Design a protein around this ligand. Structure first.
Ligand SMILES: CCCCCCCC/C=C\CCCCCCCC(=O)OC[C@H](COP(=O)(O)OCC[N+](C)(C)C)OC(=O)CCCCCCC/C=C\CCCCCCCC
Ligand SMILES: CCCCCCCC/C=C\CCCCCCCC(=O)OC[C@H](COP(=O)(O)OCC[N+](C)(C)C)OC(=O)CCCCCCC/C=C\CCCCCCCC
Ligand SMILES: CCCCCCCC/C=C\CCCCCCCC(=O)O[C@H]1CC[C@@]2(C)C(=CC[C@H]3[C@@H]4CC[C@H]([C@H](C)CCCC(C)C)[C@@]4(C)CC[C@@H]32)C1
Ligand SMILES: CCCCCCCC/C=C\CCCCCCCC(=O)O[C@H]1CC[C@@]2(C)C(=CC[C@H]3[C@@H]4CC[C@H]([C@H](C)CCCC(C)C)[C@@]4(C)CC[C@@H]32)C1
Ligand SMILES: *[C@@H]1O[C@H](CO[C@@H]2O[C@@H](C)[C@@H](O)[C@@H](O)[C@@H]2O)[C@@H](O[C@H]2O[C@H](CO)[C@@H](O)[C@H](O)[C@H]2NC(C)=O)[C@H](O)[C@H]1NC(C)=O
Ligand SMILES: [Cl-]
Length: 472
């Protein structure tokens, strides 16, 4: 089929398989969070009269898991089978022979309950409140054993029989209610957390993002796919604009993670970014000098002397966008068409001899992108510069002074701004946790109308441990 979405996330079977390595940590958390209530009553026992009993303070004492498999069922669910969770519970048995007063005082015996269980959890994914919800109403438990063992192996005659006939089957059913219920809460905590962190990665100060879902997620034998709006929000105003169409066939399913972004999302980001007054740069005395030195030039050079010239520590250059930049994705790259104002001031003791220029121009850049060693790299495939109105502010002006400045915009300006841009977007990623992941051979691929992120990842097994630990 086809979906209306600004942003699409596709998590493939291979990704689930490396995620499955930590299924046991999740099941462990579920058992540790479950409540096991006191089992009490007072029953007539054979030859022994009314006996009042209670199993008390049931606590998990040991828990291990043998293995887990994961399978995607087309249009239905993510199905995880877990074999041989062995749980040892401990508790305290308290009873007294109520009617048989001649048999002596009430008793207290420590016990353990030993079980082995296979679980089958079939999780369905649905949209709720623009959020992906998880639901496993089909959560199967199969007990291999549930055996009571008293400390000291005491048997007056009524205990093993009572446990077997009145206690285990209703306990099994209580166990299932608690475990399955708690599998459901952890699953929804983990789903909601990812979504909130996704949104956080796309947010900054007064800039937020709406990644509300546009329909129920999709499951096939090969992947699962969520479709989001991707509208940027500025000071809590958003524009609920029509959604671009998305075609599932656009994506492969061999990498672990695919992210498809419409160019409409870039339009949205350029829009709020411009509104926030962010698309600007200022270089004063020694910052201007430092920028030239980065690109292999030097304010003390002969060729800079007529422009800068005597007081290079007092140079001033500003760039700012005049209107919102225009961003397109194309097969060749991402094209940003920017209308800028570049202002120069290289003062002299006499202000009449200060070189002072302003350049209104469109600069169009075709850019390709790389991710490597935890950094974003931006590449210039080509550029075009078309001035609209150049102004000199003093008499100190010449076709060759103007052409020096233009050449600086081109040779130093463009590559400097690109450098600053990649540094800024890399720091936005890092500060939101992206650095912590092992992103493996990611590809950034531009096409007509959309950008593609494809990658494998490594899951630092300690990150899930700490998150589950942080749940308390
Ligand atoms: C679409 C991207 C917009 C930028 C591309 C336009 C090309 C540039 C066009 C013209 C250049 C002229 C001006 C050059 C100066 C910019 C270069 C630079 O020097 O610096 C980049 C700055 C960051 O500088 P600054 O914030 O300190 O402001 C400084 C301003 N002053 C001090 C007043 C607060 O501007 C920014 O980066 C703006 C972006 C910040 C967005 C923050 C929200 C985080 C959201 C998402 C993260 C990534 C999205 C993931 C992919 C989804 C698809 C969209
Ligand atoms: C993480 C999901 C990866 C796989 C899904 C890929 C889809 C990606 C979609 C969108 C991108 C969103 C990014 C994913 C979220 C992690 C981002 C992250 O890098 O965040 C780091 C933090 C660590 O510190 P902090 O929480 O204090 O935040 C403060 C962070 N600072 C201090 C660095 C600023 O948090 C953490 O890493 C918490 C890590 C544990 C949370 C796992 C939640 C669900 C993941 C796996 C489920 C395992 C179940 C196995 C069953 C499989 C059966 C199929
Ligand atoms: C992994 C590398 C991350 C680094 C990526 C850096 C790229 C940054 C750039 C752009 C950010 C893109 C923003 C896009 C918006 C995405 C929206 C977005 O966040 O989509 C998320 C929606 C929910 C979910 C489908 C997901 C994640 C994992 C899923 C969960 C894993 C386990 C969960 C099971 C239910 C657990 C069952 C266990 C039990 C023992 C039976 C499961 C499947 C629930 C749903 C999530 C992606
Ligand atoms: C001495 C100096 C005097 C000169 C004065 C200066 C004068 C200069 C004047 C004007 C300069 C203007 C020209 C420069 C404009 C260049 C435009 C320019 O560089 O535009 C680029 C801006 C960043 C971006 C939007 C882009 C394309 C790629 C995008 C990236 C793709 C994925 C990236 C994700 C966030 C990361 C996911 C990776 C994951 C962690 C695995 C993403 C979306 C970041 C944003 C970029 C185009
Ligand atoms: C900006 O410099 C002007 C002199 O420069 C030339 O003309 C520019 C338009 C530009 O093409 C540049 O490359 C050329 O070198 C200057 O313009 C005029 O004014 C002065 C004094 O009134 C006059 O002597 C000069 O000959 C005039 N030139 C022309 C061709 O019009 C202008 O004064 C200056 N701007 C300001 C406000 O300082
Ligand atoms: Cl006894």
């Amino acid at each position: 089929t086809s979906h209306e979405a600004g942003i699409v996330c596709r998590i493939t079977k291979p990704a689930l398989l490396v995620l499955n390595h930590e299924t046991a940590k999740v099941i462990q958390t579920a058992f540790q969070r479950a409540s096991y209530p006191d089992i009490t009553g007072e029953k007539a026992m054979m030859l022994l009269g009314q006996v009042k009993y209670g199993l008390h303070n049931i606590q998990i004492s040991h828990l291990s898991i043998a293995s887990s498999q994961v399978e995607l069922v087309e249009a239905k669910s993510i199905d995880v089978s877990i074999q041989d969770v062995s749980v040892v519970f401990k508790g305290t048995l308290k009873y007294g022979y109520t009617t048989a007063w001649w048999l002596g005082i009430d008793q207290s015996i420590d016990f353990e309950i030993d079980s082995a269980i296979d679980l089958q959890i079939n999780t369905q994914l649905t949209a709720d409140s623009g959020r992906v919800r998880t639901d496993a109403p089909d959560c199967y438990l199969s007990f291999h054993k549930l055996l009571l063992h008293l400390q000291g192996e005491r048997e007056p005659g009524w205990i093993k029989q009572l446990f077997t006939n009145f206690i285990s089957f209703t306990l099994k059913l209580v166990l299932k209610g608690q475990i399955c219920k708690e599998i459901n809460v952890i699953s929804n905590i983990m789903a909601d957390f990812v979504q909130t962190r996704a949104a956080s990665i796309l947010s900054d100060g007064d800039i937020g993002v709406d990644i509300s879902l546009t329909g129920d997620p999709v499951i096939t034998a090969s992947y699962l796919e969520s479709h989001h709006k991707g509208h940027f929000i500025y000071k809590d105003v958003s524009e609920d604009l029509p959604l671009p169409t998305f075609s599932p066939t656009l994506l492969g399913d061999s990498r672990m993670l695919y992210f498809w972004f419409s160019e409409r999302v870039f339009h949205s980001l350029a829009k709020v970014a411009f509104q926030d007054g962010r698309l600007m740069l200022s270089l004063m005395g020694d910052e201007f000098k430092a920028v030239l030195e980065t690109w292999g030039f030097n304010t003390n050079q002969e060729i800079f002397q007529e422009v800068v010239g005597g007081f290079p520590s007092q140079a001033q250059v500003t760039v700012h966008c005049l209107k919102m930049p225009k961003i397109s994705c194309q097969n060749k790259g991402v094209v940003v068409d920017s209308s800028v104002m570049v202002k120069f001031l290289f003062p002299r003791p006499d202000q009449q001899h200060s070189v002072a220029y302003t350049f209104e121009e469109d600069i169009v850049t075709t850019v390709q992108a790389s991710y490597s060693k935890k950094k974003l790299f931006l590449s210039l495939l080509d550029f075009q510069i078309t001035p609209k109105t150049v102004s000199n502010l003093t008499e100190s002006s010449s076709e060759s002074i103007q052409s020096f400045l233009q050449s600086m915009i081109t040779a130093v300006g463009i590559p400097e701004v690109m450098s600053r841009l990649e540094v800024v977007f890399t720091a936005l990623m890092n500060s939101k946790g992206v650095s912590l992941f092992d992103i493996i051979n990611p590809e950034i691929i531009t096409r007509d109308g959309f950008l593609l992120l494809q990658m494998d990842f490594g899951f630092p097994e300690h990150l899930l441990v700490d998150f589950l630990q942080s749940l308390s």
